[PDB]
From Swiss-Prot:
Pfam families: Endonuclease_NS, Phosphodiest, Somatomedin_B
Function: Secreted lysophospholipase D that hydrolyzes lysophospholipids to produce the signaling molecule lysophosphatidic acid (LPA) in extracellular fluids. Its major substrate is lysophosphatidylcholine. Can also act on sphingosylphosphorylcholine producing sphingosine-1-phosphate, a modulator of cell motility. Can hydrolyze, in vitro, bis-pNPP, to some extent pNP-TMP, and barely ATP. Involved in several motility-related processes such as angiogenesis and neurite outgrowth. Acts as an angiogenic factor by stimulating migration of smooth muscle cells and microtubule formation.
Binding site for 1-tetradecanoyl-sn-glycerol 3-phosphate: 159, 180, 261, 420
Organism: Rattus norvegicus (Rat)
Chief site of localization: secreted
Protein name as it appears in the record: Autotaxin
Regulation of activity: Inhibited by vanadate. Inhibited by micromolar levels of bile salts, such as tauroursodeoxycholate. Not inhibited by taurodeoxycholate. Not inhibited by hydroxysterols, such as 7-hydroxycholesterol, testosterone, dexamethasone and prednisolone. Inhibited by EDTA and EGTA.
Positions with a binding annotation for 1-(9Z-octadecenoyl)-sn-glycero-3-phosphate: 159, 180, 261, 420
Motif (Cell attachment site): 76-78
Length: 805
């Protein structure tokens, strides 16, 4: 109930919300049907429009006007934004040369530079270049401030998941807003764009910026605007709030624009009708900046111009229909469009089988424009699994396409020419970032980065301590002139053992055999020193990884590689080796094909055994350091140590063999040497975090050898490729992956062809940040470099995307 009887007089755009049934005058009241009767008349004035004209100058205050051109307007803080331009001979902000803002130039009483976050829905990254002639204010912010060529949204590249990620620093799986549409089985409730359920606080996890600010005594301007409130009024309201007394004035403000998304959907991302909305967004930016300049705030405020996602060309005829694949199509619920989520229509139907649904959707048509996944098999870089609101069965839809259940859904719902929601690596989904202000750098371009990082930076801009989040705090320090955050490296929790020769061959009863009874003081002091770590500076370029949890592990040295061997998981946590440009690929000799050798430094009790693999009809084994890249016939024997062995399905060995035999050498050739760190990952509960031993769901049959869910590699070289990887003087270059360890290659539709036609594409799909691998393994890489820690943090967040220019 709303008793709409009270009044908005002197309460227009009030900052604290008041409790029903007392009527409301805040910027959200319309959206709750809760405004006082007089809200429109008092708060939403329009008379005379939004601009002063020559003859309105020095007029007598008429309170009915939308904005004022009277003499007192300045000190009332309610001039039209162009007032000083029309009436006092001033220039537009956009026409002034830019001048470095070395320090905040703020009115007396300002305790910190304010922050204004100007967010634009559907603003595709390439609009910065392609619409540059029609957006002169935006181009001035961009070229004078700090900008990235684009910013990576989160998956799915929808409106609510991305806006709430900007607010929280959290993946949608952690913040809970996993789509624009959702079913929560615990609540038995549904979240939709249209309607009231979305207002209930139980949907919204984490801690968004406005709450972080409030709890720490920073005042927040109410972030959200009822859709009917026009843009000009939002700007004037912000400017008016900025005129409040010190004790009442907020420090952080939000403006949201529905454009260009709204038009992008109707006309496609580059439709000729898209010029106008871009012009209009720019004009609004101009009004803000002119408004700030009038208040002498234009060298005081930090302004963020940020998009939630881009926009792709998508039409009704590019729809796949599940009714073309599925016989039981009425027994499923589909969340449709640019992604697919499938569950059973009814939980009482015990004949619903996800396994058979997946198989029926897998590689069925030569040009199929979606791929089905169990959510835990999605590329780990999407971080899209650990939420009860994310259905077990997911469809990754090709860019430019839609998925629907039945054709009736598409014509009883071509209207639209643009959409978004695809894989967040897709170029058309990239969006924008521009920071302008005393705290951002001057005329600086920064590399692309992910939107999950910005919450930390907005917290830094306001002197707040961020709630725990998925950003890597410090990885965006290179955006900022000051207020940087100086993190320390995490402390190593477990130190390694350095075992020597402690066991005799005959103590091993592993069912392993090797043709190695093949016989000198020159090459014997030599093998001793290699086992003591004489070549360790060659293969361990950035120090050993730190183990950040309690465990028992050993460092093992070899001529060609170094490993940290886990006595608990019976395999390395990591294996590190360097392959120079000059290195040679060799094959495994025939006498060594099934050779597995006991490691005399590690107890039988802490070793794998060959018998488990013989018994396990599903499971085979591979090696972390590839025998193909051994430096010499004698060094090759080290690669067959039982301590370099890891469990691998035969289907995954195809993937692994090609990577190790062909790709490593190829990268060394292209990058002038590479350092490689490889290892297993165990993520049975798909939370993106290292499993403890009691979480492991699968072992090699009859043994305690745990089966990894994934294998990672981190491939580092010199950013200046004219220097070799092992003698690099400056910044580094990295690419990494987290390959799912699967008993089949159903994911790759062309897997019956030669590995040369499908493996690299699979790896590219499962590209990863080093930081993703840190979460998954409890390890911390690049501990010993000459580089600044902030720069290392930036490198650890890098994602090699494999999209063109
Ligand atoms: C991205 O960053 C985020 C933030 O840093 C990371 O997520 C954190 O990871 C922590 C480790 O998994 C996790 O810690 C757990 O928290 C439990 C209490 O948590 C509540 O309080 C916080 C603080 O206010 C709150 O934010 C949480 O909010 C979640 O839950 C509500 C729903 O109730 C949602 O609205 C909200 O969106 C959020 O959901 C997300 O997280 C949960 C898990 O917490 C998921 O299940 C959801 O899918 C969703 O993703 C909470 O309200 C605490 O009870 C846990 O402690 C257990 O485990 C420890 C091990 O140390 C042990 O000491 C205890 O015994 C205890 O076990 C008991 O509970 C078990 C489960 O019932 C049971 O089996 C046992 O036998 C015991 O009874 C634990 O410490 C933290 O909550 C989240 N935070 C957030 C915001 O998600 C995320 O990891 C990062 N991602 C990556 C890839 O890096
Ligand atoms: O006020 C907002 C808002 C702005 C915002 O800011 C967060 C800032 C954090 C700091 O960093 C900067 C951001 N956070 C949110 C939610 C997440 C908490 C909402 N909205 C008004 C319009 C409504 C109507 N919508 C639609 O009707 C709609 C719009 C576009 C669509 N595309 N496809 N479907 C669509 C449906 C979208 C819906 C949400 C957007
Ligand atoms: Ca886990
Ligand atoms: K086997
Ligand atoms: Na296949
Ligand atoms: Zn949209």
């Amino acid at each position: 109930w709303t008793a709409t009887s009270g009044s908005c007089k002197g309460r227009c755009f009030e900052l604290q919300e008041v409790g029903p049934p007392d009527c409301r005058c805040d910027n959200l009241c319309k959206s709750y049907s809760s405004c006082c009767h007089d809200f429109d008349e008092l708060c939403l004035k329009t008379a005379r429009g939004w601009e002063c004209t020559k003859d309105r100058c020095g007029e007598v205050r008429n309170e009915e006007n939308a904005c004022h051109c009277s003499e007192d307007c300045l000190s009332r803080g309610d001039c039209c934004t162009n007032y000083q331009v029309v009436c006092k001979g001033e220039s537009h902000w956009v026409d002034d040369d830019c001048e470095e803002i070395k320090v905040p130039e703020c009115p007396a009483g300002f305790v910190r530079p304010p922050l204004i976050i100007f967010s634009v829905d559907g603003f595709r990254a390439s609009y910065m270049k392609k619409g540059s002639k029609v957006m002169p204010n935006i181009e001035k912010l961009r070229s004078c401030g700090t900008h990235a060529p684009y910013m990576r949204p989160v998956y799915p590249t929808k409106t609510f998941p991305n806006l709430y990620t900007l607010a929280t620093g959290l993946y949608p799986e952690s913040h809970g807003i996993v789509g624009n549409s959702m079913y929560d089985p615990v609540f038995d409730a549904s979240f939709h764009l249209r309607g009231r359920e979305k207002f209930n606080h139980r949907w919204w996890g984490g801690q968004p910026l406005w709450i972080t600010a409030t709890k720490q005594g920073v005042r927040a301007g109410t972030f959200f605007w009822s859709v009917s409130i026009p843009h000009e009024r939002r700007i004037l309201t912000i400017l008016q709030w900025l005129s409040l007394p010190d004790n009442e004035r907020p420090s952080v403000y939000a403006f949201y624009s529905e454009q260009p998304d709204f038009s992008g959907h109707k006309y496609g991302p580059f439709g000729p009708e898209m010029t106008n909305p871009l012009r209009e967004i720019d004009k609004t930016v101009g009004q803000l900046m002119d408004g700030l300049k009038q208040l002498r705030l234009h060298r005081c405020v930090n302004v963020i111009f940020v998009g939630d996602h881009g926009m792709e060309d998508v039409t009704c005829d590019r729809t796949e229909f599940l009714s073309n694949y599925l016989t039981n199509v009425d027994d499923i619920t589909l969340v449709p469009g640019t992604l697919g989520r499938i569950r059973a229509k009814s939980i009482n139907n015990s004949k619903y089988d996800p396994k058979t649904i997946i198989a029926a959707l897998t590689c069925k048509k030569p040009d199929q424009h979606f791929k089905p996944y169990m959510k835990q098999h999605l590329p780990k870089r999407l971080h899209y699994a650990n939420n009860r609101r994310i259905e077990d069965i997911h469809l990754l839809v090709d860019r430019r396409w839609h998925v629907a259940r039945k054709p009736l859904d598409v014509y009883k719902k071509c209207f639209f020419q643009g959409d978004h929601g695809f894989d967040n690596k897709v170029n058309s989904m990239q969006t924008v970032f521009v920071g302008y202000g005393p705290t951002f750098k001057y005329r600086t371009k920064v590399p692309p980065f992910e939107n999950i990082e910005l919450y930390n930076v907005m917290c830094d801009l306001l002197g707040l301590k961020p709630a725990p989040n998925n950003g890597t705090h410090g990885s965006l320090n290179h955006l900022l002139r000051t207020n940087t955050f100086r993190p320390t490296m995490p402390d190593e929790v477990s130190r390694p053992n350095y075992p020597g020769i402690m066991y005799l061959q005959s103590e091993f009863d592993l069912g392993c055999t090797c043709d190695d009874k093949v016989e000198n003081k020159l090459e014997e002091l030599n093998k001793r020193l290699h086992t003591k770590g004489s070549t360790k500076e060659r293969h361990l370029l950035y120090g050993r990884p730190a183990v950040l949890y309690r465990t028992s592990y050993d460092i093992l040295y070899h001529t060609d590689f170094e490993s940290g061997y886990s006595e608990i998981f019976l395999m390395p946590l990591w294996t590190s080796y360097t392959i120079s440009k000059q290195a040679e690929v060799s094959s495994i000799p025939e006498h060594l094909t099934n050779c597995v050798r006991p490691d005399v430094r590690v107890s039988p009790g802490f070793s794998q055994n060959c018998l488990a693999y013989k018994n396990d009809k599903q499971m085979s084994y591979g090696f972390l350091f590839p025998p193909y890249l051994s430096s010499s016939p004698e060094a090759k024997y080290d690669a067959f140590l039982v301590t370099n062995m890891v469990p691998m399905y035969p289907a995954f060995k195809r993937v692994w063999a090609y990577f190790q035999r062909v790709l490593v050498k190829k990268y060394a050739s292209e990058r002038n040497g590479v350092n490689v760190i490889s290892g297993p990952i165990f993520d049975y509960n798909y939370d993106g975090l290292r499993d403890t031993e009691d979480e492991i769901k699968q072992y090699v049959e009859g043994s305690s050898i745990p089966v990894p869910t994934h294998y990672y590699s981190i491939i580092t070289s010199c950013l200046d490729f004219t220097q070799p990887a092992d003698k690099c003087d400056g910044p580094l270059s990295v690419s990494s992956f987290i390959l799912p360890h699967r008993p089949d290659n159903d994911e790759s539709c062309n897997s019956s062809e030669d590995e040369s036609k499908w493996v690299e594409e699979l790896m590219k799909m499962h590209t990863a940040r080093v930081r993703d691998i840190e979460h998954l393994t409890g390890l911390d890489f690049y501990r010993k470099t000459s580089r600044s820690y902030s720069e290392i943090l930036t490198l650890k967040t890098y994602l090699h995307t494999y999209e063109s220019e």
